[PDB]
Ligand binder design. Structure first.
Ligand SMILES: [Sm+3]
Ligand SMILES: [Sm+3]
Ligand SMILES: [Sm+3]
Ligand SMILES: [Sm+3]
Ligand SMILES: [Sm+3]
Ligand SMILES: [Sm+3]
Lengths: 156, 156
């Protein structure tokens, strides 16, 4: 690793979680619309990481802001890079998380969030095939989470 | 986050740890030489992440391979991007870690590793100022670790 390399500045960071319940259902957040006839796409509870702050703590805070649920990160799953049209790079971080016990889902309805909810493994497979999951990485990490927790893999 | 972006493929991933002992000393690994008169530079225990495997588990394994110490990741600190001369991108991941109790440091001497050892906060500051820390990010993360653990910040 003593090989010379240059720094590739990353301007933005986002942090989110793949939160599963006892049945292996995954918690997703839905965007508010897209034509006016279609429903918004789904994504994992996530949000922006403040410059200089810990991404893991941000994942916990942002998840609560969107779903109203207090979560505990259990293990890092992965990070991936995206580039906006203008060249800005964003590094997204994803953790496997567990919800604290005794909580009721209470999504924060905003101009960006329609709602949030738990979706079963079978229904997620349908949503994915129907092109309703905003970022395909969600399926990659959900699969990792199911394996980590000892749940059956996604249908077919 | 519903804004369109493209994928920026990252070909290589590395995972390492900032491991501190009860006194706040940091565990570092030294490269084998550099002119033949100078000592190798120092870096955190780290190694390559296999394609498709969990970076956090890799951090634990690679740390043990270089230092002979079994470590437990306690919290994710950050990830950053580098680019090799040929254009290849490498994403380095860093975790704060704790060493399992009752262990003796036993570095793996190879053509790439001269040795490994715990360095105090004061001596790290000297090594850094003397340009002996391969990646400056090591100081950034050591500072984070000291704060997280409640230790005094690096000298001056
Ligand atoms: Sm926020
Ligand atoms: Sm850029
Ligand atoms: Sm996978
Ligand atoms: Sm290895
Ligand atoms: Sm490339
Ligand atoms: Sm910092």
């Amino acid at each position: 690793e003593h090989d010379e390399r240059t720094h590739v500045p990353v301007e933005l960071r986002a942090a989110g979680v793949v939160l599963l319940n006892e049945r292996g259902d995954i918690l997703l957040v839905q965007e508010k619309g897209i034509h006016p006839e279609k429903a918004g796409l789904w994504h994992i509870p996530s949000g922006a990481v403040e410059d200089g702050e810990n991404p893991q703590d941000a994942a916990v805070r942002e998840a609560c802001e969107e779903t109203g649920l207090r979560v505990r990160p259990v293990k890092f799953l992965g990070a991936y890079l995206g580039r906006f049209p203008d060249g800005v790079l964003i590094l997204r971080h994803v953790w496997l998380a567990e919800p604290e016990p005794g909580q009721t889902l209470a999504p924060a309805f905003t101009d960006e969030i329609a709602e949030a909810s738990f979706v079963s493994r079978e229904d997620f497979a349908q949503l994915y095939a129907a092109g309703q999951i905003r970022m395909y990485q969600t399926k990659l990490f959900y699969a990792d989470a199911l394996r980590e927790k000892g749940f059956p893999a996604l249908p077919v």
